[PDB]
Amino acid sequence: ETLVRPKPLLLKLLKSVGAQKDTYTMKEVLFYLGQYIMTKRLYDEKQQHIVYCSNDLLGDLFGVPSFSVKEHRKIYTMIYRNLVVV
């Protein structure tokens, strides 16, 4: 119900995996973002919670060259800091 307009960098990540809209739901932002890491195979193949994005656009949005998906606050900081809520 609550819609978001993602900022230029976060939008290029969602759009680079096949998403064509500009206003998203939180479910869609999390789907397309998780699909971006899977398509780009950014996850550590053995412990798939670790995400390497040092030479990736995701790293600019994140701040660090790597993160663990278990760090929810850190992931939600990048998500809401790079979107406009309506």
């Binding site: 939180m26 479910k27 999390l30 998780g34 890491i37 899977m38 996850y43 798939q48 919670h49 998906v69 278990k70 929810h72 992931i75 939600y76």
Partner: peptide, 12 residues
């Protein structure tokens, strides 16, 4: 992918 299960713990 075991990645996807980890990532689903983000939402709702």
């Amino acid at each position: 992918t075991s990645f996807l299960e980890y990532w689903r713990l983000l939402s709702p």
